[PDB]
Each structure stands twice: as structure tokens, then as C-alpha cells.
Amino acid sequence: EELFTGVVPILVELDGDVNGHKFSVRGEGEGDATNGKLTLKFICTTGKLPVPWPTLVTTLTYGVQCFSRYPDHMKRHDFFKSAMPEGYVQERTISFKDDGTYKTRAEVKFEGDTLVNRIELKGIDFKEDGNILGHKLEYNFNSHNVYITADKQKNGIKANFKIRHNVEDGSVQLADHYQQNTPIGDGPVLLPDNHYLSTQSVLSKDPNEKRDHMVLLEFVTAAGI
Amino acid sequence: QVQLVENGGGCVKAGGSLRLSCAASGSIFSINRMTWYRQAPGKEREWVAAITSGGSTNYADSVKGRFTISRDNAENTVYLQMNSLKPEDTAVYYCEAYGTYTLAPTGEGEYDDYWGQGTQVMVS
Amino acid sequence: QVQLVENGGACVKPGGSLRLSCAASGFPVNRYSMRWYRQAPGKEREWVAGMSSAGDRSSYEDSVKGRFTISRDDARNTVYLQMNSLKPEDTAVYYCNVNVGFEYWGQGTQVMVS
Amino acid sequence: PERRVRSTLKKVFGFDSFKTPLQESATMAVVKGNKDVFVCMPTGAGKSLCYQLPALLAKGITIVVSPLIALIQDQVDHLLTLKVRVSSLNSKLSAQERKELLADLEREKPQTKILYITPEMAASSSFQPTLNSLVSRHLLSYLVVDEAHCVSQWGHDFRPDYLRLGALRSRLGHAPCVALTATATPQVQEDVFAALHLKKPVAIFKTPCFRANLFYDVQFKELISDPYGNLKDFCLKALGQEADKGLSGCGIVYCRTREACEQLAIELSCRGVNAKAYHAGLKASERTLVQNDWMEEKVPVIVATISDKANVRFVAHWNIAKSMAGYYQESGRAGRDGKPSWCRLYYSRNDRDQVSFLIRKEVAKLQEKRGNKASDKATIMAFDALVTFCEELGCRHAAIAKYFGDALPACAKGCDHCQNPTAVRRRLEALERSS
Ligand SMILES: [Zn+2]
């Protein structure tokens, strides 16, 4: 907790393989855990991300939920910040409906005084003429609720949540996300009771950069306890 | 845990009457009070009626005459009867079920409160 | 800044027709796409209808496919959605979703066949 | 996990294993600390461990609040004889000692892991800057309100300082809270939960009051032609048990009036079962001799007016108690061993009216005092519940659980209603006809 007091720099690195298409994205920015603010920029190395940006919004930012403005009466239930100095491993499968599946594994830790993430992604049995492979997803990203429940056997937290993506035509694409968060450190981890984190995000594009800007300003608040 | 279930939501024209049922499941030793909350779209949730262990009834001035609250402790089921209904009262309803004291033969129990899923209503 | 108002929700017997009207503030309706979400009491929200930004292409869900209609009007700055024939599976609140940025949930209109 | 708690039990306290699985569950829940806990166990059941073991296993100080200073001193001695690092910040300490204690508190990672502070001292301006330091440093881990029942007005004891301990609980919000009570009531439980500002989810660990070894049943002296004969027969049956084994153990018969107490004792002696009055008015020497001879195998049964043996074959209440809690406590010693034991109640309309008049006079005196009115209300409510239980139709264990707030019991055997529901129906019909 005392490490998050104030403003904390954040760096994220992901290397995904969508049906052979290998892409890498390295983003950076700032986060304020006290106010639950997260302002990041994820400029992918590839000129064009093989998949839409909203699809990887949940892989590049929701892998860092320790910045959520956990209420003081739920600060104990902040699993992420607990055992954070040692880091934690987040393995998540996203089943898109009729568009295939994402398999992702990320490691969240500190380097110096900066939060860092090592993420790896893979795409399986995709549909080329689907909403995602067709790039029909709208740039804007909706607000979503992420439900979290502690499992004692793995002394971790399993997370469930459905993500909705807006489409240019008008359809809403629903994806179901199964996630597991396991502690890397052997110290006492604060296993939380069931709670849902509300996440409200905005995507924008800066004028200057030729490469994809992927400006993301998000605010996360814990709730349900 | 306690799973509160709503029932009885029905479409009634102005002046029609309908009953909203709210049933608590699981093992409950007692409920402190059950309060209904009319939450209209684009508005703030408004308390409707309150029933407390022993039968004390509280009503809001808006719904003082038209609505009535009853409860059966044998089934732990609270009912709200709605008569001479007006077009103003078109909003979803919920149950607070405050002070739900559950217990087990071993003795382990819980005191948290549980909220109902919700029921619909309309007026012509 | 941006607010949404939904009206026209009413009770309808099967085979009737109902139109829900969603008026918008703080942004032009043509430049931005619109959607309608359906939420039953105590169940998960489900999308039903949607208009693209240009308004040339519209999409519907499979359950009400061909039985729902959606349209837009710029002079009045308001979108409309027509139920056409009603079935007891339409008993859910109808929220109007459009965000220029962020997420903006409309108050919605509560409709049910009964 | 379980290994750490077991190691702590075997090293610090010495117990090989938890006394009861409920105690284990309560201790684990407090160790986790996710939700505020409320423990309700009888004296000697190990409730003090529920808040002590997590403190030994917790990080930082835990503040324990107790009503009396003598109780704090006793707890401090009990923790010191176990070589545990316990401290007490009380005005009774000397200037040098208190200065050293405050200096240790100010230092990071304070040596003390459990601090017993009276609520007044914590609320006193002297300790306010220390509490501010604690909140700033997040030193406190658990807030233990021992004897929390004092907060409830309906409880026998009222402590005005716990109402301010609740405000203190509002502050230091991060730390969880554990409220301990000896005997709890649903009204008292709700009062404790509301007054201490505990989180709405509350882990309630309450021992089941019903005893599967024990058999409950109520009789009415008006219906029985010869109540003394029935009393003698029941006492002989319970004590005798199997003929070959012979008489074993010793029974207890509770008396209300001293004259009635000695009358019952002498009548039992004449019938064939010797007994000792053990009257309060009896001089100390004779009282000690009778208590001894009852503890010794020589005397079959004893009569008691105010108040233990490892095995008690039966427990008969000649007159109804003042409150159902008192009756339950008195009957708890019935068959404290694993061998079957039975209890009896000789409820009578005249005796019930007489004790109700006594309770009314006591409540009138309390009202004349003009203080602790809620205590009088709770006492009269408890007496009403006890008389209803005497007149109640159904499982006796179930009614006791309903009163105490215990979960309904699975009294497959050892319940009067279960064995012969028709007999109970007939008995109550006969009582109604008589009245
Ligand atoms: Zn029974």
C-alpha cells in the first residue's frame, strides 16, 4: 500500500501470436491508486495491430488492477496490492463468441519503483469474416464490471467477467473472460471476499504520433463489499 | 446465503391492484426488517414501505393510503398489496431484507443483508 | 455534459405495437452510432437493436429478428425503436446506449407484455 | 493455514488440538480477518484463545478492551506465565513504566503484540496522540472487544465506555473487529452489532446450547397426585441406572425457598435418598462440609439454593428459575460427563405467580432507582420466555434454541416431544382442563 501512495509510473510489454501473426506492444504511463486513475499509452510495434484495440484493452490494462481505488473499508480485500511487492501471475482465457479464443499469461511486478508487466497472448480457432477479424469493432470502449472470488486451494483469486464491444454495424459483441491470479511471493496474501471492480475507460488518439497512439484514460473503483 | 425471489409483477391499468411477493430462502433465524424500494428510471430510489419484526409498519407519505405491507414469519415472505394504483407508481421494486440472521446446527452463521433481484410494474 | 432521456414505454397486449423514443443531449446523433439494450429483472443485459453512425446499416438480435425496427431523426435529435408484434419474451427494460466518450447509460423505458 | 495455527497451539498454549471444531472454525475466521467476528462461547470453552492465537499470529499490536482492571491484570498474568509478550497501558502503572511503554509504542515494530487498555484510557486525551500514531503507522491489526455484551442495554451489565469504543471502532477502520461474549441473545447480539459499528457481514460463532446427552421434560405438580413420590422415583431411576452397576454419580435438586429447600432435603432423606440442603444461610463450616460430602461419593444427591461434580445423573428444578438463562446455566451441569443424564421441571401455577411477583417487585425497585430500565425490561422478558417454555408445546431443545438464538436442534433422541408427542399433548390438555 505504502508503495502506491502518490503517483506511480507504469510500463507494460505484451507479445501476442494471433494465428501466426506475431505482434508486440510496449506501453507506458502513470497511475494514481489513491484517486483510481490510470493514464497510459500503448504504442504497438506493429504498424497495425492484427486485432482491434478494444479486444486487447482487457489484456494490457485489466492485468494491472492494483491501482483500483479500493475503499478504506475494503482496503483489506485489495488482493492485488497485497503480495504486490513480490508480484502475481494472471492467466486468462477470453472466449469470444464465434470469433475464436484468446489465451493470455501475464506477470505483474515491480522494477525499481515502476510497475511492470510481462504479458504473452495467443489466438486460437478464429473466424476470418467475424466481427473481430473484420475490424468492425468501434474504437470506443465501454465500462465493465469484473467479478472476483477467492480460491483457497491455489490461494489466489479467480475472476469472471463479460466484456461488450460496440460494432460499426450496430451489433454488440459479447466475450466471456475466465481469469486466475496466483501470488508469486510466499508471504501472507490477503484473500478477498467476493467483489466486483467497476472500470470506466476512454480511448483517444493523439495528433502527433504516426504509430498507433492508443491513449487510454481509465478509472477503476472496487465495490460489492 | 439467502436467495430472495420476487414475484407477482403484473400490468394493471390505473386503478388496478396488484401484489408483489418477496420470499427468502435458505435458513433464516429472523429478519430485522424488509423494506421496498421503488427505483424509477432516471430518478433516485425511493423507499416505499417497511415491515419490522413484530409487525410495525412504516409508509411513505406518497404511498401512505394506496399501498399496504404484510409479512408472514412462518414462510419469511413479505407481500406488498397495491390498490387504487396511479400512473406515477411505474418503477421497479426491490427488497432490502435488512438484518438477515442465519445460523446452522453447528452454530456458524452470518448477519449480512441480502437484496432482491427485482420485480416490474406498469400503469396505463 | 451528455444526457439521455427515454420515453414512450407502455404496457401492450400481444399483437400490439409500441414505439420507444430516445432523445439525446450534448452531441449530434448522426455523427455517433446508437444502441438499445434489454435487461430483464434480475437477469443479464442483452443487446436488441443498433444503428450505425451513418444510419445506413442497422442490426437486430435473433430473438426479435425481423420483428423490431429502429430509426433516427436529426431534426428532432431523437431515435425511435418500434416493437411491432409483442411476445412475452419482450418483458424487460429497454436502455438507450450511446457514448461520445466514456460510457453513457440512458435512463431507459420499462416495457412488458404481461 | 492450519499448520501455523497448530504449531502456535502446540508451542505457546500447549493444547494438542482444538477443544471443539466450532472453536477451530472461529479461530480460523478471526485469523483470516476478512469480516468482523462475534464469538459466543461459555466460560472455560476456550473463547480467550479465539482472540489470542490470531494476535500471536498477527502483525502489530492488537488492542483488547475489558470492563474491569482486575480482569485485565488476570489476563496479563495468564499471558505472562506463558512467556507471551503482553502489555497493559493503564494509569495504575508507574511514571517510569508508562514512559517505557509509550516509548516502545512509538518505536517501529513495537515489541508488544497484544495491549490491554481500558476503554477510558484509550478515550483519555493522554492516549489520543498514541492512537493517532497507530492509525498513521497502521500498527493495529485486530480490535478485540472482550465482554462486548456490556454494550447492549438489555444485558445484565452496562458499560458506557463501549458506546465510545464504537466511535473508536469507526476510526482505525482498516483493522477488523472481534466481539466476544459469554452468553448471547438475539436482541443482545443485534445491540452489540449496531453499537460497535461492525461491518454488516458478521461471522457469528455461537456454541449450540442443546445437549444430546441430556433429556428435557416438564411436569406440572397440579396434575401429579403425589409430586414428592414422582421426584423420588425419578431421582432413584437416574441414580440407579443399571441394577448390576448400582448407584453412581450424584444428582442436584434446585430449591427456591430455604424452608422449602430443607423440607425437600429431609423428605428425600426419609424416602431413602440422603441429601444436604447446602442453604446459603447455612454457616460457612456446614456449607463446606456438605459441599465436600457431595463431591465425595458418600452422599447420593444434593439440594442447592444458590449453586460442581464431573458426573451428575439428574437435575430437577422443584421451582422455576428467575430467567431461562439461569435455568440453562443451572441445568448445564446435568450429566457433564458422557453418561446419559435427565432434567426435570416441576412447574406450578402458584410458584410461577410467586416468582413473577418477586420479579415485579425487583423491577419496581429498579425503576425507583431510575437507572438500568432496559435491564429490568430484559429480565422480565427472559422470565416471560422461561414461563412460556414451561408452557410451550414442542421440542424443549428447539424452544431453548429459539430463545438463546441457537439454530434448531436435531434432537432425534433425548427430547420429550420427540419420544411421546401424544403423551405431551395429553399432559398439556390435562393441565388446561385443570386450570
Ligand atoms: Zn425434539
Residue numbers in the entry:
A (entry chain B): 5 to 229
B (entry chain K): 1 to 124
C (entry chain D): 1 to 52, 52A, 53 to 82, 82A, 82B, 82C, 83 to 110
D (entry chain A): 12 to 318, 324 to 451
Q: Which text from the study accompanies this structure?
A:
Here, we show that a generic and kinetically biased ‘Gembody’ (Gb) interface, previously discovered through trapping in crystallo, can also be trapped in solution by kinetically controlled side-chain-to-side-chain bond formation in a manner that leads to ready generation of complexes; these display ideally balanced interface flexibility and yet relative complex constraints, in turn allowing rapid cryo-EM structure determination, even of small targets. In summary, our plug-and-play DiGb strategy improves cryo-EM resolvability and resolution of small proteins through constraint and increased particle size with a simple and robust workflow and can even enable simultaneous structure determination of two challenging targets in one dataset.
Interfaces in solution and in crystallo are approximately arranged in an isosceles triangular form with C12 at the top and the Q120 and P46 or G47 pairs at the bottom.
